């Protein structure tokens, strides 16, 4: 599923992501924009042979199991395929564990490079939330 901007903002809010670990909803929307362009089915192979999955490009080295990532962990206890769902629950639950990991939203390099310090509130501008 390809979400609308306000549509994804609303689902992220519904799933308790607004201000989770102190990150406003605009941050999460901005990250999703640059990670996946709001597309739940997004996948991207990394140079190290791991893969990133879903609206938040969660990586198979640490977080989910895809069956093809040597020496990896599955810290969210989920097949990476669950992260491609039109229902965002698995992605939100796993992103909560990632952002609690110690480096906050810096875990998402696109967030650090494209969202961090910006006017992220623009991402939820005009949304009925
Ligand atoms: Cl947009
Ligand atoms: Cl915001
Ligand atoms: Cl393969
Ligand atoms: Cl694996
Ligand atoms: Cl594990
Ligand atoms: Cl699995
Ligand atoms: Cl959803
Ligand atoms: Cl933080
Ligand atoms: Na894996
Ligand atoms: Na893994
Ligand atoms: Na393997």
Swiss-Prot record:
UniProt tissue specificity: In the egg white and polymorphonuclear leukocytes.
GO molecular function: beta-N-acetylglucosaminidase activity; identical protein binding; lysozyme activity
GO biological process, one term: cell wall macromolecule catabolic process
The protein's Enzyme Commission number: 3.2.1.17
Family matches, as InterPro entries: Glyco_hydro_22, Glyco_hydro_22_CS, Glyco_hydro_22_lys, Lysozyme-like_dom_sf
Locations listed in the record: Secreted
Annotated positions binding substrate: 101
C-type lysozyme domain span: 1-129
Keywords of this entry: Allergen, Antimicrobial, Bacteriolytic enzyme, Disulfide bond, Glycosidase, Hydrolase, Secreted, Signal
Intrachain disulfide bonds: 6-127, 30-115, 64-80, 76-94
Catalytic activity: Hydrolysis of (1->4)-beta-linkages between N-acetylmuramic acid and N-acetyl-D-glucosamine residues in a peptidoglycan and between N-acetyl-D-glucosamine residues in chitodextrins
Catalytic center residues: 35, 52
Top-level EC class: hydrolase
GO cellular component terms listed in the entry, alphabetical order: cytoplasm; endoplasmic reticulum; extracellular space
Function of the protein: Lysozymes have primarily a bacteriolytic function; those in tissues and body fluids are associated with the monocyte-macrophage system and enhance the activity of immunoagents. Has bacteriolytic activity against M.luteus.
Family: Belongs to the glycosyl hydrolase 22 family.
Note, other: Lysozyme C is capable of both hydrolysis and transglycosylation; it also shows a slight esterase activity. It acts rapidly on both peptide-substituted and unsubstituted peptidoglycan, and slowly on chitin oligosaccharides.
SUBUNIT field: Monomer.
PANTHER family cross-referenced by the UniProt entry: LYSOZYME C
Protein's recorded name: Lysozyme C
């Amino acid at each position: 599923k390809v979400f609308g901007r306000c549509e994804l903002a609303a689902a992220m809010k519904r799933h308790g992501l607004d201000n989770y670990r102190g990150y406003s909803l605009g941050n999460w929307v901005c990250a999703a924009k640059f990670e996946s362009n709001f597309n739940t089915q997004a996948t991207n192979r990394n140079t190290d042979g791991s893969t990133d999955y879903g609206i938040l490009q969660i990586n198979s080295r640490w977080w989910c199991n895809d069956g093809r990532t040597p020496g990896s962990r599955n810290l969210c206890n989920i097949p990476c395929s669950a992260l491609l769902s039109s229902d965002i629950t698995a992605s939100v639950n796993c992103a909560k564990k990632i952002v609690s990991d110690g480096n906050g939203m810096n875990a998402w390099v696109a967030w650090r490079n494209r969202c961090k310090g910006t006017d992220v509130q623009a991402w939820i501008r005009g949304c009925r939330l």
